[model samples]
Target: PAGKAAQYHKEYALFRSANMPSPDKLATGVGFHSFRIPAVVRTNTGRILAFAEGRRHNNRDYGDINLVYKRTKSPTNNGENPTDWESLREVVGTGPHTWGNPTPVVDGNTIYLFLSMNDGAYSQNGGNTLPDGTKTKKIDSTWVGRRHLYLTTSTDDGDTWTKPVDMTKTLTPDGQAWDAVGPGNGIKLSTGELVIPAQGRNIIGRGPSGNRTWSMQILKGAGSEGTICQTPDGKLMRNDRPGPMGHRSVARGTLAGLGPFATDNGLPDPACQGSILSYNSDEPARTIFMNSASTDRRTAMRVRISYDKDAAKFNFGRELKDAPLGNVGNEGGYSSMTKTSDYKIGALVESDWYEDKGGEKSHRCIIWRRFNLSWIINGP
Candidate 1:
């Protein structure tokens, strides 16, 4: 600990510092207050890259948010706690600007981060307005941030990364508005294809090198934040929230024939970001989807399992359910998960401090939870 006293070999601390929207904010531990929109990926080298939106100033999703990450210490302990993770650090973003949506894909020794960067002129609450000459008032309009897909690669596991390489002209074309990559992780098909779920479409990154060629085939039109996975039969499936009337949108398709997205009544969404992943790709494939699992609030978080292809229903198994610690707390909201190499489920979940502490705290925080599939099935 160069900057401070060493607490332990592995340590646990708050991800984002206190948020004080003033000119007198201190550096490091007193700037940003909340960390939302988490994403986690297990590198081929056994390192877990945990990403988040370092929301500065306030809890609003659209302001000066930096894309930050922290990797587990090499040769992780699997000690079942947050100390298994390293100190939080920034990956992208700066003052008065924004970089949100952490979409990661691990291919062999390389890890690619697909992110979205924008200026403060565009707010998620529709409060910011563009200049008069701007054609569509949308932040992702042709004149805006599309065609500027912020991509960065890490060859040293999660230790270092090349500065963001823009992939705008080729990946994000004209008229691609309100664009977003994964607020979660991506999926790799059995066919050796890497697909990163996005807004309005799911981007396919193929071949050895991801920079040269790419294609955006429109798959889901439900929401900008989407998650995708390949079924056992070689078909593509996308599950997205921001649905119609608080329902989750699920779509299944092929590269050639994409299908219309339909609402899944079982996966009740609170218009929040959720994560879907391929837990096991072999025989008797199992897909896992985690979310708030509520109609109007971020409570009753669940980790549902399905053995079927599309996972249309998950009533067979005793799904892992979690209610808040008390009557006024939250068990989950925005989450990102990965299947660890050691046959355990690794998830980074977001919790509301106001509910959890009765407004005694000024900020919310993220939690790292580790559990095995067997424990989920057999536990009460």
Candidate 2:
């Protein structure tokens, strides 16, 4: 594949915070205080779907969270016009319960979305302040109160979605307490298998419907917020955010199972979610990866390309902080990537806004960026 000439690039805020007055009011306009956890994918028909967690009352993870999204009317033109994106729509905004972690995978014309659901009254790790200012207890793995794994699908691009169906009973392993799907996107293998990265496992979907039968491959040593990609040689690689390691934990394997995770010193992570794309698996194989590119903070989002079949090393890299659109300030939170139909890299990245009026308040939003390989290869 040839690179672009002038390094085409552009970006803008896709999700705005309600705390930011008027012109900056919540872009979704669904009365959500903020949006976070971006996950994006370009459907087979060329429509781009951007997803997020619409925080109803505040920016916290719990309490009245809904899964929301916006899709492009047509394929993106390097994301040059923000108007091309449709108005925000809710996928599952039914109740006060938390519906989050929008991990989507496209198979043929249908899109499979996986989410992590739980009671809004309980927090993942416990002791978090609830909307009523009361401390929340940690969610348990018991059948009655455990965090759930649900699936929803759309056959007609992203125009509409089927009601989410709980798959916890069939998919989740026994006694697994805390769990999370890709707060990002999943991948479809050449063998027609759909791989959805989870906290400590990769949920595999196979058969005719793509998700007809399900299985789980345990990922040892891999931490939460997992992102996966298939190398050119057909091995699945789990590149995940390790627990306080300041580096990415990587493990490679096949459909049978995965090996132990090992720290990859080359990819410095701030313990934040990262995304990977298997751009081209044929000759001149290219795998694209993006992360905060730091060990202590979620800033300086960098994109890198791996030329090898194993993706053990990413040779060329560029920083989003250096884009011509000007600095987005401190960025690089949760992100998702996909190779656009126009042969560009489309990304939805997280940025934070904080205000210190009477008290310090933080609101999280998303930024959409589209660029060519030339932009990254050209360097900062």
Candidate 3:
């Protein structure tokens, strides 16, 4: 039979701060705190790059944080299995500026990394108003330069990376209050356009050469931490987590403009970041979405599927539940899932199930899991 292997293989890998350098091992202020915002992508050469924010100083969102990543070795199984990942590596991080939210896209041999850059001098600070005059309380401290879009690339399959280059002048508009690019994964639409989800808009990138041309397509009822996927007819469908909404917001249109958004789809979430992938948009189309399925807590992570190419409805969802482990609540926090090269689902999930001897709870790590379509279909 000509088909993917049917056997199920499940494994787990942790991103222990102790495994890092001396100060990072402190796992508290002045040292690396918990890891958050998991993002993963398999390159054209079949290598998996897992990324997260190495929160420094404290677990607070503002302050010293670095963009960190781990790449799988050339050993058997590649990134398909948890054991295939190599040691943790830092892609870009330094000084007091916060480098966070690793949104990525793999174009040919080059993997483009997009992130949100801000100064550690200011914080969100639980305020209702920002200098930009927005209704929500997003990042709005001028002390830390307004959020901008930054880019870097790795040609050697995550081995070496180019320096961080600013794309804000081209990607962002002058009147824009704030912006964010892909705390999750970006999609290269079937039309050959690259779409990266962001706050209030989707960063559209398209160039024959790659990662050069860009613009912001405004979305009605726009939200941050958005995910985009192309339907069978080439229309784009984007779902976003607007700062902990119990359900996600949905929008659809071409690269020109997306509008007339809908609020919820029965996918109640804890407002944490989730991952969405277009499994196949051809006949019998399929789209897969995974997130923390609970409203108030990041537990009950589940995967839902939609057969309609237009994503009209996601009829089935299965809790890819794993047995309880250890003393910590290894349930869910932030997750990024991608279809592996071998057609299996590869996920890098954040779980803060431990607290070191210090009072710093939420000692975090990533749990990499591998499962298949059969396993999901057979699941609840």
Candidate 4:
């Protein structure tokens, strides 16, 4: 029992805070009204990168959004201290257009970040009034109106990034109007390929340059906001949030192709984005999944682990609300997970604060938690 307490250590911190006025500025001098859609990854050299969308005006899905992130100051710190995180930095925020859906994959020292870009004047469905009281054009109204895909990379341990390269014309399928990348992190297979989860498909990245040349694989029966993981049996499993199905839609396949999706009764979802991670492939193989475990609400955040080869069943789970950190507020909109270098699970989970003076206003923020397996199994 000497080191048992260390095994169950758990810590929590506010990763992002919502800004009130039109442009609430951070310590880094960057401005944003709210932050949402978290995605995180630990690089090869032990550096942790946390990504989110910096909503310029409000917490809505459209408008002037920028892809932003914060990296740990010291790669060896293991991201245990909130102060150790560097100032917030932007990946792409030059214009009024929206740059969102940060899907990052790491191969060696190189980090490949995939994003979805759209004109701020337009939204996916259109006709919705923005916070500025302007109506938006339907993104899928025509081919030119559809959302586009872009890729950006970093080789210096996330200290710097290159301009995003538009890959919509090449990667998007023919006649596909609107698209979205994983609002969560992507995965690099053991076989040396990068898989970026997208709407109705998975973008397969390969070649010597590390995801330089890519192809797309269709995911039949899958839904939007997909998360992926490779099971110990070597099969790629896509667990997606279905459309009001009250359960997660899952499909199994390889890099060649994926089969039709079927709802997994074992995993109850509230139609929110969940996170999955292949923790290990060798001894003590484990696959981890986290989401709101309710059929109708996103209040009960649960994390589950699967030891089976195919990850067909996740019998072990714990609720965040019941954790020692206490209830994490009203909303758990989306989450992203990664294994920290210190042998603990790192998670970025969404929480909401509301203001109803003039009208109902939701201020979204992200909470970061680092805990070991012992804490998850300990229960409340």
TM-score of each: 0.83, 0.93, 0.86, 0.93
Error of 2 at 131 (Å): 2.0
Query: Relative to the true structure, how large is the alpha-carbon lDDT of every model?
Result: 0.68, 0.83, 0.71, 0.82
lDDT of 1: 0.68
Top-TM-score structure, candidate number: 2
> Who is ahead in TM-score, 1 or 2?
2
Instruction: State the displacement of the C-alpha of residue 142, model 1, in Å, after optimal TM-score superposition.
Output: 5.5
Model 2 spans with C-alpha error above 4 angstroms? 1-4, 21-29, 75-78, 209-211, 324-329, 356-360
* Residue 172, candidate 3: C-alpha displacement in angstroms: 2.6
RMSD of 2: 2.4
Largest lDDT belongs to which candidate? 2
Q: What digit string (tens of lDDT, one per residue) describes model 2 on residues 213-247?
A: 77887777777789989999899999998789489
Please state the error at residue 135 of candidate 2 in Å.
2.5
Per-residue CA lDDT of model 1 for 1-380, tens digit only, reads: 11132211211232533532221122365356677788898987778888888777556556567888888876455534555656667787655567878899888888888988766656544544333322222355655543246788888887887888777666764566566787798877777778888878778887874443468876535477888877766788888877544868888887665688888888888888888778886766888788876788876567767778767776433223432233212446888878787767777777665632543234656666666666455434
lDDT of 3 by residue, 172-237 (tens): 666554567778788887767788888877887778635457787867787777888887767988
lDDT of 4 by residue, 1-380 (tens): 11255445555545455443233255568677678889899998998999989887777788889888889998988788767788778899867788999999998879999999898888877897887788998888355578889999999988889999999888887777788899798888888888999999999988864546888887777887899899999999999998894989999999989888999999999999999999888767889899999898887889988888999999647888765354334557799999999888999888776554223256667778887877676664
Model 4 is weakest, by summed lDDT over 10 consecutive residues, at: 15-24
Q: Report residue 79 deviation for candidate 3 (angstroms).
A: 2.0
Native-vs-model 4 lDDT?
A: 0.82
Residue 20, candidate 4: how far off, in angstroms? 7.9
